[PDB]
Design a binder for these strands. Structure first.
Ligand code: CL
Ligand code: MN
Ligand code: MN
Ligand code: MN
Ligand code: MN
Length: 134
RNA sequence: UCGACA
DNA sequence: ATGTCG
């Protein structure tokens, strides 16, 4: 029941909190459609969140109605709520990740989209195509 | 007390 | 090990 005609996104990190990045790939081919420059400090969930929002913006800009796959239950909820409930401390070092997160929320609250955000069923389909981790 | 998704 | 939700 995999919808191959879709966009798959996923976070990648070195430590958690740690260096965070993310990418979006064509679920069907695996071709990398976009990738975020590594952010010094952030959490896994913030990254998973930014990945979905970037995916929403990527698809809207190209007038695509394809759904987005994410393996993050947390990020999917945050996007649904248009509010990332991260409890990562807000300080000088986490300023960048928080700026991106707040700006992502800002975009969600000022734009519209019908993009279905679907849960990638890892336990049945294996690793999401945009995966970085082992 | 966990269970789940990362 | 941590980040989060049910
Ligand atoms: Cl971003
Ligand atoms: Mn993931
Ligand atoms: Mn990268
Ligand atoms: Mn905010
Ligand atoms: Mn992954």
């Amino acid at each position: 029941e995999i919808i191959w005609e879709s966009l798959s996104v996923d976070v990648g990190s070195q430590g958690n909190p740690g260096i965070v990045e993310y990418k979006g790939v064509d679920t069907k081919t695996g071709e990398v459609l976009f990738e975020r420059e590594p952010i010094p400090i952030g959490t896994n969930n913030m990254g998973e969140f930014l990945a979905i929002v970037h995916g929403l913006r990527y698809l809207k800009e190209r007038n695509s109605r394809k759904p987005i796959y994410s393996d993050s239950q947390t990020a999917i909820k945050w996007v649904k709520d248009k509010k990332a409930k991260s409890t990562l401390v807000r300080n000088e070092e986490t300023a960048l990740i928080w700026k991106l997160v707040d700006e992502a929320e800002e975009w969600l609250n000022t734009h519209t989209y019908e993009t279905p955000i679907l849960k990638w069923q890892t336990d049945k389909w294996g690793e999401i195509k945009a995966n970085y981790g082992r």
